[PDB]
Design a protein around this ligand. Structure first.
Ligand SMILES: CO[C@H]1O[C@H](COP(=O)(O)OP(=O)(O)OC[C@H]2O[C@@H](n3cnc4c(N)ncnc43)[C@H](O)[C@@H]2O)[C@@H](O)[C@H]1O
Ligand SMILES: [Mg+2]
Ligand SMILES: [Mg+2]
Length: 328
C-alpha cells in the first residue's frame, strides 16, 4: 500500500515534463504526432540543459506545494496568497485571460473572502477552465485519505474556478492521481474506482466522459479524431481532464504509432501532446498520473534535464513525501 518517494518524485517530474513539452504545441490547432516524435528526438540531442521553460501550470503547482508545506492542514488563505504573489512575480508564464482578474482582485485589499473573486468570474457563473486541475496533483500526493483529497481538491480549485465544472474537474484529476498511486491497479479497477467516486460527487458530464473512456478502451486503433471529438482537447476541464485520464490509460499498452522504445510515461506524454489543443495542460495532467503510477524510474535523465527547475521540483518532491509520511 505505501506510496514511495519514487512515486512522488515521478508524479511531480511527470507533471513538469508534460507542461514544458506540451507548451511547445499549445494552441496550434493542427498538431501531428510526427511533429511530436521529431520534437522529442531533437530534445534528446540538445547539449544545453534546461532549455524548456515551464508555464503557469508549474508556477501554480509550486504555489500549491509551498502552501501545503507551510500549512499542511490546508489553509486556503495562504494558498490564495501564494497564487496571487506568484502571478505578480512572474505574470508572463501563460495564465488564462480570465484568471488574471482573480489574481488582481486577491492582490487588492477589497476582498476578505478569498473565494469571492473566483465567484465573480464570467457574470457570476465562474470559470469552467482546467486551471484548477492542472495544478491539483500535489493534493493526492500529500493527503492519503481520499476524502481529504476530494475536499481539498475542491477548495484549492475554487480559489479560481467557481463553476462546478472547474472544481469537479479538479477533484477528478486529483482522484486519478490518488488511485494511480495506491498499488499498480489494473485498468478496470482504476476506472471502477473513478466511476464510483464521481457518481457520488456529481460533474455528471465527467461521469459520462468516463463511460466513453471505457468504450474507447474496449476498442483498438481508435483514431485521434474520435477522441478529440468525444472527449475534447480544450481549455475547459470537461474537455481536458477526461482526455488526460484516457491518455494515461491508453498508453498502458503499446500504441502502434509510438515506437515502443519509449517507456509508458514517455509514450503517455508523447501521445497526450499529439492530441493538440491545450497540450501543456493535458500533458501535465497525464504526466502527473503516469508519474504517480510508474514512478521516477520512467522519468529518464535525458528528458528531465531539459526542463527549467527540474532540481527545485525534485527537491519539492522530497518535502511532499515527508508531508505524506506525516499524515500516515
Ligand atoms: C495558455 O493556456 C491557459 O489557459 C488554460 C486555462 O486556464 P484557467 O482555466 O486557469 O484560466 P481561466 O480561468 O481564465 O479560464 C480560461 C478561459 O476559459 C474561458 N471560459 C471559461 N469558463 C467560461 C465561461 N463560463 N464563459 C465563457 N468563457 C469561459 C475564457 O475564455 C477564459 O479566459 C491553461 O491551459 C492556461 O495556462
Ligand atoms: Mg500553460
Ligand atoms: Mg495551457
Amino acid at each position: 500500500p505505501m506510496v514511495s518517494l519514487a512515486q512522488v518524485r515521478g508524479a511531480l517530474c511527470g507533471a513538469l515534463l508534460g507542461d514544458c513539452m506540451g507548451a511547445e504545441f499549445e494552441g496550434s490547432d493542427a498538431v501531428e504526432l510526427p511533429d511530436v516524435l521529431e520534437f522529442v528526438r531533437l530534445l534528446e540531442k540538445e547539449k544545453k540543459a534546461g532549455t524548456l521553460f515551464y508555464t503557469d501550470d508549474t508556477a501554480m503547482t509550486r504555489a500549491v506545494i509551498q502552501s501545503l508545506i507551510a500549512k499542511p492542514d490546508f489553509d486556503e488563505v495562504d494558498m490564495a496568497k501564494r497564487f496571487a504573489e506568484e502571478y505578480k512575480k512572474e505574470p508572463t508564464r501563460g495564465y488564462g485571460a480570465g484568471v488574471v482578474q482573480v489574481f488582481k482582485k486577491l492582490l487588492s485589499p477589497k476582498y476578505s473572502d478569498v473565494f469571492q473573486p473566483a465567484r465573480e468570474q464570467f457574470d457570476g457563473k465562474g470559470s469552467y477552465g482546467n486551471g484548477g486541475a492542472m495544478r491539483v496533483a500535489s493534493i493526492a500526493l500529500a493527503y492519503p485519505n481520499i476524502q481529504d483529497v476530494i475536499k481539498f481538491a475542491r477548495r484549492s480549485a475554487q480559489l479560481t474556478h467557481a463553476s462546478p465544472l472547474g472544481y469537479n474537474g479538479a477533484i477528478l484529476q486529483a482522484l486519478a492521481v490518488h488511485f494511480a498511486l495506491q498499488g499498480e491497479l489494473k485498468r478496470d479497477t482504476f476506472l471502477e474506482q473513478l466511476i464510483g467516486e464521481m457518481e457520488r460527487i456529481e460533474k455528471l458530464p465527467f461521469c459520462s466522459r468516463l463511460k466513453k473512456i471505457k468504450e474507447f478502451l474496449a476498442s483498438s486503433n481508435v483514431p485521434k479524431a474520435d477522441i478529440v471529438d468525444e472527449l475534447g482537447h480544450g481549455i475547459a476541464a470537461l474537455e481536458s481532464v477526461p482526455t488526460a485520464i484516457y491518455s494515461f490509460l491508453h498508453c498502458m499498452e503499446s500504441d502502434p504509432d509510438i515506437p515502443d522504445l519509449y517507456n509508458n510515461l514517455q509514450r503517455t506524454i508523447i501521445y497526450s501532446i499529439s492530441l493538440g489543443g491545450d497540450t501543456d495542460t493535458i500533458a501535465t495532467m497525464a504526466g502527473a498520473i503516469a508519474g504517480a503510477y510508474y514512478g521516477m524510474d520512467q522519468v529518464t535523465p535525458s528528458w528531465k534535464r531539459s526542463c527549467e527547475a527540474i532540481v527545485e521540483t525534485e527537491e519539492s518532491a522530497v518535502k511532499l513525501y515527508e508531508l505524506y509520511c506525516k499524515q500516515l
